[model samples]
Target: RLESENVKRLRQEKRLSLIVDLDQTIIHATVDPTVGEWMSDPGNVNYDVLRDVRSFNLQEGPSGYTSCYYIKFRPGLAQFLQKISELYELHIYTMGTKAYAKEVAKIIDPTGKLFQDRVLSRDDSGSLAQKSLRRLFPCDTSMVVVIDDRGDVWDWNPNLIKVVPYEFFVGIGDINSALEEQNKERVTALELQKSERPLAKQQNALLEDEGKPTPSHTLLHNRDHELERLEKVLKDIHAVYYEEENDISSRSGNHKHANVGLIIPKMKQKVLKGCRLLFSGVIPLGVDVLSSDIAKWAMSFGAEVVLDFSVPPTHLIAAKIRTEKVKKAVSMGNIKVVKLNWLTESLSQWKRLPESDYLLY
Candidate 1:
């Protein structure tokens, strides 16, 4: 099969397949005309911030309604893509329309040297069905790694390394969020956007009165550095894959194979090894503790998740202090009661950080 042959070649080259998301992962797009107005007017308070944004006119449907779309590249995107392309064959898997994906890809990979034509959009992948690794890697997905902002789009596939959603276009929910009619989560976000619009306007008014540029303004201050962290993660994954492959082939005389799916979990589990975690007020009451995403995420990193203090735990992850579980965990004295950031930070950095830095007290 072509997939098997590709995998063999990839193994020889020591590279892996990397599927990346477009909107909210590497770039953020919005149809708001206000961005263009701000960019055109030099006197506009937001002009400086909107300077780097790029715009294109998009024709929608048979009605020929031309909508001007603005795109903001996630910070450090060019360099990140350049470095990552070396260890992986890049593929763009976006839920955006075919036309939108093509335009965005042209801007990101103008030379066609990086992505080429390995682009998969919702139009080709089937809108009704979830994004599947099988669509691209028909026979085997062992060597494929997916980086997406929305895990639901891929149905939380194990191959996915979920990215922190980029919300650069203030008061505008993901431009394509309305396309998936059945997704109530996106609908909720859209509703929130509607309510947030007034609040954002009021904030702008306050800033105008203050006559000072505040860092609190999300639009004015682009503080996103997710790509830097993501670069480290991707490098580590590639290194681990090839290192394990080399070790196996040399020791076993080429009889053994190193599967990415198998190796990633083992590498991740080592991060939280020898630790047991109890979540306090993290999961809702009715939901199963083990089934929650946080619990599963911690468990995947080699932490044992407990329902209560019935069993002694190494760490008590608390959303807030003064909770009953927190009080109980405090009295134990041996348990480390820490904020959720402690766990998240440790996971992001792929190492066990000192508990003293994140103590709840």
Candidate 2:
């Protein structure tokens, strides 16, 4: 049995609470006046991209000028919410002001079927800098999951499935705040974040060229479809949560004891079972290999991360060529010296892809 009656009902329904982030997760928002202007002009270089973009005036300044916030939905976002609302109780958690979060909610969930007053903003978060599940589910977070772009804000919560930031308005960082330092670390640690998802960088570069629009296929694919992959990940997690619940019910008739905090990590650990990894140039200098994000991610996925060559590693995850670790792993002849994708791709796809494809050339 669970701790509370509400949780009992939650277990009965076989559902979990999903805390969805607003800016840069489901949507990207900015106070950029240019977007509103571009939306109204057919000849504007960003017209097509801004055509479907929505804007709402927050409040008029003392000068009688209205400050507007432009919002762009991540592609497939509507359908993703539509589908997931059935399996989970959805809540909005944002670092933005309450007014901003409420306005965005109305645009995204007009009928209130999805969110329905379950909005918690920075005003309600009780802290200026970070988000905590304890703010919402103070008693227990075992069945709660969070989808956010900024993992650092959540302190990299175990329940967090960090999504890539949706940067529809180029150069305008998170409308509510910024993350240059943490994002830089994220980029370096997860080397695959940029190179594989080069759409954002290319879009930024192309959009930099004013008025001369080059709508190539590469740029055309720039729409934020991160939601598609995220949708699958959420569904899989929900499926596993219930599957584990059913297992618990069969033995002890205590399905209420089912906890995602316990289940999801174990489920993920099976993905890379029986593997040992050593990183070469993947971690920054002065950072402990074990303390790095990539190392924790691999360890969470059931891989043993080694710090030295004395104990042979099954895989050497190299970020750059000619590193001593890479050279040593190559000399060993038994180790699979592979690129970052060997782990990143495997983790993303939730399957151990053949190492041959990711092997170092």
Candidate 3:
């Protein structure tokens, strides 16, 4: 409630309030020893990808300095934040330690231009399961939109924009998450650590080993792609907001104010309105054929999801060309077989791509 008046004032001035999630949202961070090694050694096989990577050390009092964090910004991150900051007042909401979050903010928003003292990390929130907008936006949430990888934490907030989680360092996924929402979709060495966590030492030891083998690399991950979608969704909201209001002045008498009533949020969700999608091997192993995760994700964008071949979905979500459904779709002719990442890319791009561009291998 403290900032309620200020928020209302911003609303009157025609801007929206956006609460952004860090870690896997805009950037992927890891405390993996291998990442630290990759950052340090330029000759490492993964050096090219690690060379431009960012690093920062946490000064934790008695425990002293923890290992430096290796952070890779999602592609188009700087541009996305800068562009979105123009339309909405940005706030950093992360599950990371306050020290880690602040350090990250300093790297991305060095001048504090995008976020000044507006960072709310795990330290500020204090409770992982009890994240609420009440502490920050208290009196009104009508104008606020939240972007987070995990929806279970938001609880009652209706203004959330869910984005795909970013898992860059396969050996150790978001070091911040407590493994509360097990991401079996791309289960990595991170799962091994969670399996036996009472000994944080074992986790460290295991990750230390990940720093051993030199695998491969990238500039970033789905993290950036998702940022692109958020950018579009926000822009879509802004454009439509004006469409419903005025540019030079007030819309007759309504004042062209805020996404407070969330008209933009409503319109953006219907972006994928007509196609029905079928899953091949996209579902995680051991899970039902129709897992809620990807299904709900597809439905969120307005695509109808189906399981049976008899139903004839317009699209096939295949992770491998060898999947039976992919073969079936091939014979069907009309059915399009798409690689699983297509769904992810489309969600982030906020525009459907041609099936030919993403045909299953």
Clashing pairs in 1: none
Better of 1 and 3 by TM-score: 1
lDDT of 1 by residue, 1-361 (tens): 7878898898888799999988889988876556766788897666776788997877655445466778999999999999999999999988777888889988999999899899988789756447889889977887899998776677666677778778777645466754433455544543454444533474466666755556554355477899998898889989988888888889999788677778777777899999999988877889898877777667768888887777889999998767988888887879999989899778766688998999776
Candidate 2 residues 69-154, lDDT tens each? 77888887888999988888899998877988889998999899999999999778888799998888889887898888776788
* The best candidate in terms of TM-score: 1
Q: Provide the lDDT at 112 for model 1.
A: 90
Q: Which ten residues in a row have the lowest lDDT in candidate 2?
A: 186-195
Judged by TM-score relative to the true structure, which candidate is superior, 1 or 2?
1
lDDT of 3: 0.68
Worst 10 residues of 3 by lDDT: 214-223
Model 1 lDDT-worst window of ten: 190-199
Which residue pairs of candidate 2 clash?
A: none
- TM-scores for the candidates: 0.83, 0.78, 0.68
